[PDB]
């Protein structure tokens, strides 16, 4: 088990996928009209737990990615990525909350997924992967919250 | 030979790009951008992608279950998300230029998955030659609407 930079990298790189939906945000008087729960994060915290989280999945993708049989995990960090990806310009570029919220379900199902995939391999990687399991947690009950608090208008059918 | 597992979960996993695309549907402001002469009909598009997910998650299925497949594994991750990327921010937020560096990152992590699968399983790196092929002429469509179109705010 080494600090594989190839691996790393190419992990910390494809991050920059979802790094780059939040780079293309802009101030939203939309978004700043929302009702919000108490608990709502200030908007400056959320770039900075993202990218300390970038760091920990691929480090955490970096150890497993080195283990024999990690086949079915990797394919579980792949799912959780892309559905990861996905979010940001639903809910913030077409402001559909409510496919926002079956789309960062489907990414809790699958860092959940990767998170127990990662344990039966290494319990390190699966450490790292815990605080990424309970920021998704926050982030559905925030889309949640903004669905329960707010007016929301039809999607396009 | 076929784990099925492996297969639906990357299948799954192309559920993320092919949302984009259900949610997306090829503007009037797309339809409007003058388009390069080679441009195909509207219904190519859906078939193609359609196709490459299947061919990509068969690809990824095979490689994940031989040994030293990580570094392939992660390249797939990459292309995946660059890919899942890019129809938000040409379709959506209609960033042209954004969007040609997205795709261009895409093409990149695609040559290198491909390349990474011939290593380990010639038939998998097969299955990626189509993609790099569309993705080849996704670079250039994108490229091409901003050449063509390059009076438009959204185009820089
Ligand atoms: C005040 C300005 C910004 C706010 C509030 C912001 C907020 C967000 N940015 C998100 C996406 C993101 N923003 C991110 C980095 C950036 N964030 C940026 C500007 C902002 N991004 C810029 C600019 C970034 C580029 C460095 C990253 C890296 C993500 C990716 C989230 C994800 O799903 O991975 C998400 C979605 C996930 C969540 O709810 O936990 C929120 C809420
Ligand atoms: C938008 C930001 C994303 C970064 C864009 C850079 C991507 C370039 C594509 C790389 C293709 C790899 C080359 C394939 C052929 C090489 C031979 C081979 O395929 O085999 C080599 C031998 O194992 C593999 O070498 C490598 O792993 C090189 C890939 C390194 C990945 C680029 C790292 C970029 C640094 C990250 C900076 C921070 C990112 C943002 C943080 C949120
Ligand atoms: C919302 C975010 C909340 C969490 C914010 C945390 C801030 C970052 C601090 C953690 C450092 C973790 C260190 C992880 C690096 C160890 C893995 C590694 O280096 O492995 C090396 C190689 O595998 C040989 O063992
Ligand atoms: C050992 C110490 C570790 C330190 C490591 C670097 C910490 C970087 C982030 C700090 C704040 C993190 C929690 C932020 C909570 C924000 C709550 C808030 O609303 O504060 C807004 C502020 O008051 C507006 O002026
Ligand atoms: C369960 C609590 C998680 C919630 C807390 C979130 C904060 C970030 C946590 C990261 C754990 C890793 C940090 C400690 C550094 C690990 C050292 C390492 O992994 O080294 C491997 C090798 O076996 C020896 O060096
Ligand atoms: C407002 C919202 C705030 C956030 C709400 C809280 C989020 C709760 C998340 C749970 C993470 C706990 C995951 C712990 C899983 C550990 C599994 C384990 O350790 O299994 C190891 C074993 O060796 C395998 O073989
Ligand atoms: C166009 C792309 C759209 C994307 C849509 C893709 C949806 C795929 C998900 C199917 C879930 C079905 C769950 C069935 C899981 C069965 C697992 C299984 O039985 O695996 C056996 C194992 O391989 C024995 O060794
Ligand atoms: C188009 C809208 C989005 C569509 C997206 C659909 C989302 C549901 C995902 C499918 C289930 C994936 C099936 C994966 C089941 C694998 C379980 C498994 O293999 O367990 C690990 C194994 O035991 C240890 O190696
Ligand atoms: C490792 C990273 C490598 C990948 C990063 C690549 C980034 C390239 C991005 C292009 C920005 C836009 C510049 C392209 C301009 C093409 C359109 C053009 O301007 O056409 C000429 C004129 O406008 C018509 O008359
Ligand atoms: C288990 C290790 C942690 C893993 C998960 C990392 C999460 C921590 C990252 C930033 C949260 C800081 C933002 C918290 C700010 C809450 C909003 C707030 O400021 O509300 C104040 C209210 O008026 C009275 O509490
Ligand atoms: C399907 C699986 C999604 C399961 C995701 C679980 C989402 C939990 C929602 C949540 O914890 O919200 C925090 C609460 O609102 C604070 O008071
Ligand atoms: C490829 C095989 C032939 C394509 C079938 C075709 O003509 O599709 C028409 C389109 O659906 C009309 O809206
Ligand atoms: C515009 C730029 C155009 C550039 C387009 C090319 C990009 C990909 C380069 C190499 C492909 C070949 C990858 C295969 C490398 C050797 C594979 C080998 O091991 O053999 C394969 C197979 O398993 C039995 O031959």
């Known amino acids: 088990m080494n600090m594989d930079w190839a691996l790393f990298l190419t992990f910390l790189a494809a ?4 790094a ?3 780079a293309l945000l802009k101030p939203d008087e939309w978004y700043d009209n929302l009702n919000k729960p108490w608990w709502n994060p200030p908007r400056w915290v959320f770039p900075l737990a993202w990218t300390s989280l970038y760091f920990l999945m691929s480090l955490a993708a970096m150890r ?5 049989g990690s086949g079915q995990a990797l ?6 990525l892309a559905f990861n990806t996905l979010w940001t310009p639903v809910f913030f570029g077409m402001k559909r909350m409510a496919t926002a919220l079956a789309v960062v379900m489907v990414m809790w199902l699958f860092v959940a ?10 319990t ?9 399991l309970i920021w998704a947690t926050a982030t559905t009950g925030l889309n949640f919250e903004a669905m329960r608090l707010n007016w929301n208008r039809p999607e396009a059918r």
Not at 124 to 132: H, N, S
Request: hydrophobic fraction near 55%; charged fraction near 5%; charge should be negative.
């Open 15 to 18: 991050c920059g996928a979802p």
């Open 20 to 22: 780059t939906t939040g």
């Open 64 to 68: 497993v990615a080195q283990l024999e």
């Open 75 to 80: 394919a579980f960090y792949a799912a959780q």
């Open 113 to 122: 997924a990767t998170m127990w995939a990662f344990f039966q391999l290494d």
């Open 124 to 132: 390190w990687a699966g450490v790292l992967f815990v605080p990424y």
